[PDB]
Amino acid sequence: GRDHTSKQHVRSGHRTAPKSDNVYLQLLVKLYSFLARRTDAPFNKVILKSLFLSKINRPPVSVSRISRALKQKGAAEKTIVVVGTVTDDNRLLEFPKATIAALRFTAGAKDRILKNGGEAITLDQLALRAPKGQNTLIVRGPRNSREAVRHFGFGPHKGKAPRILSKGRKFERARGRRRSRGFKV
Amino acid sequence: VLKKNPLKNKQVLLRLNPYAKAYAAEKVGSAKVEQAKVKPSKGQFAEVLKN
Amino acid sequence: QKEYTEAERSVIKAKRDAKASNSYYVDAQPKLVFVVRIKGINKIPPKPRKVLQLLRLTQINAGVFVRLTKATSELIKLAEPYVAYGYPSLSTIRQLVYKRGFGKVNKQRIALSDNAIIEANLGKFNILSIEDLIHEIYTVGPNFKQVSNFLWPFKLSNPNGGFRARKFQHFIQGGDTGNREQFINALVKQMN
Amino acid sequence: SRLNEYQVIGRNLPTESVPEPKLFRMRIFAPNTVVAKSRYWYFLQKLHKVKKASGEIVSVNIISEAKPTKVKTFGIWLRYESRSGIHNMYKEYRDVTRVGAVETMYQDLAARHRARFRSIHILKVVELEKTDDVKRQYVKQFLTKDLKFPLPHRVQKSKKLFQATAPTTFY
Amino acid sequence: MAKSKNHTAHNQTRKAHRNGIKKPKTYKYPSLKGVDAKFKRNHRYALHGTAKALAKARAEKSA
Amino acid sequence: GKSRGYRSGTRYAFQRDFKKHGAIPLSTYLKVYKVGDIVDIKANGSIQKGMPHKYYHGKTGIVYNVTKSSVGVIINKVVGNRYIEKRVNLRVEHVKHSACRQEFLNRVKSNAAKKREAKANGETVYLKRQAAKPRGSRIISTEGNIPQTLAPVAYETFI
RNA sequence: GCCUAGACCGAGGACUGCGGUUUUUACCUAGGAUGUUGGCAUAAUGAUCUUAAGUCGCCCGUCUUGAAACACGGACCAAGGA
RNA sequence: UUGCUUAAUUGAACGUGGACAAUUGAAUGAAGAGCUUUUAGUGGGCCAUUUUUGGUAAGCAGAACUGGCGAUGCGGGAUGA
RNA sequence: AGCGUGCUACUUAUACUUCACCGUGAUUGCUGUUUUGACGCUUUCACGAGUAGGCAGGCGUGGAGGUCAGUGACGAAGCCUU
């Protein structure tokens, strides 16, 4: 017998492989499993983990975020790495010239990058021109902007959104939401 | 693949403790101590007998 | 080895001289204790259970070295009804480390079969050999914490010859728990 | 138990107010020095304001018998607890060693009074030099001139289960 | 007919210590909720002015 | 009829000390509390305004708000399996500075004072506190202190 | 330090290591059993089934704090059956 | 810095800049820490030590702390949650 | 072969120690020898009770798309059988 100070036979709780069965996504894991194992660069181990992430943990990165990242001091010529989809943003007034490496580009996002003299490469082409991820800048999309997060942790005095089907004056606005109808929480 | 006890295996003992050879060569485990024959209890400590 | 021998001879000489000059030589209190958990893992109150977990005594017949201070003494007092502890001799420490010495390397129990294993994990504390480790344990040194935590808790067997008739009572009243102070060596010889 | 006689000397822990505390000595009959030092504190705390935490053990020494091969009669003064109260007795023993007579005492009071080791305090163990110091008849009868006695009805311990010859008890 | 157990705290500390008892996290900047409004009102101007002063300070050594 | 009012069970906790009734000495009203100070809570029965609940009697916390006659104290209370920060408004009569700060603040200055000197003298010094170690060897001299022999005493009734 | 009696096991499968003797770019007891001999291959050996012996073994499902229960359902079998 | 505060250049709060490095300031330990979503069953309990209320008491009724049984076999108590 | 007490040896749990094998979790390494398996191979260490319940990997039945140019009147399917 043993006095177990912790729970036994506990899995790490992290993804060790992609849930997807895309054969091409698995070639990227194969390529970055080798680089993470054989290079000892911190960038390689970060990319390998991001390839495992689910869809909601890889939110789209707009072409505006990349614009804002390229505007950092000394980051105008860094290689933008996005493990996910790069989408278009019609709100931009101008886009610079830069190389962006991404899993996927929308038609609009790819168009604007090329129209401004930039280059849209995939993550395998990145491993050629940067096997160590030299001079890169990883950009991630906003995770908490998802609509499902609005309702997480709903409760009294929390300020989260109720899980409701219809919005209007007759739908959960009277008692508990108004001090004229009893109380407000 | 197999732990060997240095207290049974001489080669493992020499591998771990090179000084062991000297300890055996100098008979350190049975070394005499040179001293005179003295009895320092004849005085007051003889109150162990009675007090 | 030379300093062990000279320390013993100096202590004996001091005792003899104090006997000569109508004095009394009071020996230095022990600075190291060996603690063996001799009680199973069932029906333990929360406080001694937590104390035993902090001493890394998570199984029966498991032994560990503890440097005696007020804090650790009060720790051991809470675990007294479940452990037997005492002041170990040098030969006991050497036999323990040689036969049952394992180090904690990357949270793995690795046998101390070569001085390279000890060096790779305790070189920054100037421990280059099994003898360096034994010396650090015996004469409780500056790096005692690291060396003792590097040692995996010793896994002794049941005594050859058994315990007394009933264990779970204090050694003073014919049991086995508590402090026996030099008889830890006979027990460890039974158990190692 | 199987006992030894120990000298234990102790004192209060030195204080800046009291820098040379008085040394106290006791003769303790214990199986080992771990119990001997424990029994010492047990009797000091019954006689003086001291504890193990606030005190110090100075010396522990075995007291060997002066004349281990000389037959003596020991008078022992006792203080034991019964189921009802606390009593004093004085009992006498014939033995060659001071320790063994105490060992006889512990067996004796267990047999005749159901008194456990924890229930007994030995106030004093004294050698009886003179014959008139003997008060108890169960030891006085062995001090007579030219004492002889046979051992009738000798029982011989047999190694085998079956003996082919009739048993005998001569001696 | 329905006399049952009224109340007990038996097993309640065990359930508390399975995942607890977790201490609250500390942060460099605690919230100013419940702080006196007069101090809170003034603390706004003091921080606003400090940001202006630094912005000028970084201006002289930048361009 | 169970009763669980606000001040239930405070018969002795909210009593004044023996021969300490009446007016409050004004050192209470002269002490200065700053946000971030560590203070002890001890309800004074003679002031019924700004009185803490009986739970906070004897608890220590951090001052986070200072008002005209009160301080806001933060207490962590175990509610189930976690702690909750409680924000209690207390008149300063119920509040006292915690003395645990000053001893540690002294050690902060003492440690710095000792450390800078060791650099000055070209040596090094160890600043961590140490638990009381077992005592070293010593020699007991017996001039005037020949050991007294003690024996257990006979039983005797003393009524 | 030395001698000495017995029991159980032999995972691994080119080399790599740490040591020792160095008489040596050699050998070793030093990162896990080999050598030799006899017998058998119409069999020594192993497995299963039936049975004897020794020892242990209360009738399942269920509700229940608690079932072998003198609590309830169940004679048996097939097919259907949530 | 402030519109708060002071008779005030006093403060209060937040800062700029500078010094103090592995004894960065007790012990021991750490199959790592933190965070989130979602959902199951459960919401009849009982027993032992110790504290304890009602009762003459109860294999009675009701509480406190811990450990157990339930949910658990195994060695001992012949048999037994 | 009772009671009190002490000692010596001895008996044996699914407990402990060493070893083997299984699984789970973690962990070492593996593409200029990656070579037709990298959802793989490989090194090491620890762990293994379990109702209600949860999750994972599998086994089996009727029918469907593809494939085995599959089996079969020289005997399919079914059924019985140390």
Swiss-Prot record, chain C:
Instruction: Provide the protein name.
Output: Large ribosomal subunit protein uL30
User: What function does this protein fulfil?
Assistant: Component of the ribosome, a large ribonucleoprotein complex responsible for the synthesis of proteins in the cell. The small ribosomal subunit (SSU) binds messenger RNAs (mRNAs) and translates the encoded message by selecting cognate aminoacyl-transfer RNA (tRNA) molecules. The large subunit (LSU) contains the ribosomal catalytic site termed the peptidyl transferase center (PTC), which catalyzes the formation of peptide bonds, thereby polymerizing the amino acids delivered by tRNAs into a polypeptide chain.
| Residues of the whole record sequence present | 50 to 241 of 241
Q: What Gene Ontology molecular function terms does this protein carry?
A: RNA binding; structural constituent of ribosome
User: Which GO CC annotations does the UniProt entry carry?
Assistant: cell surface; cytosolic large ribosomal subunit
Q: Oligomeric state and partners?
A: Component of the large ribosomal subunit. Mature ribosomes consist of a small (40S) and a large (60S) subunit. The 40S subunit contains about 32 different proteins and 1 molecule of RNA (18S). The 60S subunit contains 45 different proteins and 3 molecules of RNA (25S, 5.8S and 5S).
Record keywords: Protease included? no
Q: Tell me the compartments it is located in.
A: Cytoplasm
Q: Which GO terms fall under biological process for this protein?
A: maturation of LSU-rRNA from tricistronic rRNA transcript (SSU-rRNA, 5.8S rRNA, LSU-rRNA)
Organism (species) = Candida albicans (strain SC5314 / ATCC MYA-2876)
From Swiss-Prot, chain D:
Q: Which InterPro entries match?
A: Ribosomal_eL20, Ribosomal_eL20_dom, Ribosomal_eL20_eukaryotes
Q: What is the protein named?
A: Large ribosomal subunit protein eL20
Instruction: Describe the subunit structure.
Output: Component of the large ribosomal subunit. Mature ribosomes consist of a small (40S) and a large (60S) subunit. The 40S subunit contains about 32 different proteins and 1 molecule of RNA (18S). The 60S subunit contains 45 different proteins and 3 molecules of RNA (25S, 5.8S and 5S).
Q: Which Pfam families match?
A: Ribosomal_L18A
A GO BP entry is: cytoplasmic translation
The family database entries (SUPFAM superfamilies) matched by this protein are listed as: RplX-like (SSF160374)
Which species is listed as the source?
Candida albicans (strain SC5314 / ATCC MYA-2876) (Yeast)
Family to which this protein belongs: Belongs to the eukaryotic ribosomal protein eL20 family.
Swiss-Prot record, chain E:
Show the ranges annotated as biased composition (Basic residues): 1-26
Subcellular localization = Cytoplasm
One of the record's GO molecular function terms: structural constituent of ribosome
Tagged with keyword Cytoplasm:
yes
Q: Could you mention a single GO BP entry for this protein?
A: cytoplasmic translation
GO CC annotation terms, alphabetical: cytosolic large ribosomal subunit
Query: Region (Disordered) spans which residues?
Result: 1-35
Q: Which UniProt keywords apply?
A: Cytoplasm, Ribonucleoprotein, Ribosomal protein
User: Is the keyword 4Fe-4S assigned to this protein?
Assistant: no
- Record's Pfam families? Ribosomal_L29e
Q: Which cysteines are joined by disulfide bonds?
A: none
Function description: Component of the ribosome, a large ribonucleoprotein complex responsible for the synthesis of proteins in the cell. The small ribosomal subunit (SSU) binds messenger RNAs (mRNAs) and translates the encoded message by selecting cognate aminoacyl-transfer RNA (tRNA) molecules. The large subunit (LSU) contains the ribosomal catalytic site termed the peptidyl transferase center (PTC), which catalyzes the formation of peptide bonds, thereby polymerizing the amino acids delivered by tRNAs into a polypeptide chain.
- Indicate the family of this protein: Belongs to the eukaryotic ribosomal protein eL29 family.
Entries under PANTHER family matching the protein: 60S RIBOSOMAL PROTEIN L29
Assembly description: Component of the large ribosomal subunit. Mature ribosomes consist of a small (40S) and a large (60S) subunit. The 40S subunit contains about 32 different proteins and 1 molecule of RNA (18S). The 60S subunit contains 45 different proteins and 3 molecules of RNA (25S, 5.8S and 5S).
Protein known as: Large ribosomal subunit protein eL29
UniProtKB/Swiss-Prot annotation, chain F:
Pfam family of the protein (one)? Ribosomal_L21e
List the molecular function annotations (GO) for this entry: structural constituent of ribosome
Q: Where in the cell is it found?
A: Cytoplasm
Any Gene Ontology CC annotation: cytosolic large ribosomal subunit
**Major localisation:** cytoplasm
List this protein's GO terms for biological process.
translation
Give the superkingdom in one word.
Eukaryota
PROSITE patterns in the cross-refs: RIBOSOMAL_L21E (PS01171)
Decide whether keyword Magnesium is in the record.
no
**Known InterPro entries for this protein?**
Ribosomal_eL21, Ribosomal_eL21_CS, Ribosomal_eL21_sf, Translation_prot_SH3-like_sf
Listed A to Z, the keywords are: Cytoplasm, Ribonucleoprotein, Ribosomal protein
Q: How does it assemble?
A: Component of the large ribosomal subunit. Mature ribosomes consist of a small (40S) and a large (60S) subunit. The 40S subunit contains about 32 different proteins and 1 molecule of RNA (18S). The 60S subunit contains 45 different proteins and 3 molecules of RNA (25S, 5.8S and 5S).
Function according to Swiss-Prot or TrEMBL: Component of the ribosome, a large ribonucleoprotein complex responsible for the synthesis of proteins in the cell. The small ribosomal subunit (SSU) binds messenger RNAs (mRNAs) and translates the encoded message by selecting cognate aminoacyl-transfer RNA (tRNA) molecules. The large subunit (LSU) contains the ribosomal catalytic site termed the peptidyl transferase center (PTC), which catalyzes the formation of peptide bonds, thereby polymerizing the amino acids delivered by tRNAs into a polypeptide chain.
What family does the Swiss-Prot or TrEMBL record give for this protein? Belongs to the eukaryotic ribosomal protein eL21 family.
The protein depicted here goes by the name Large ribosomal subunit protein eL21
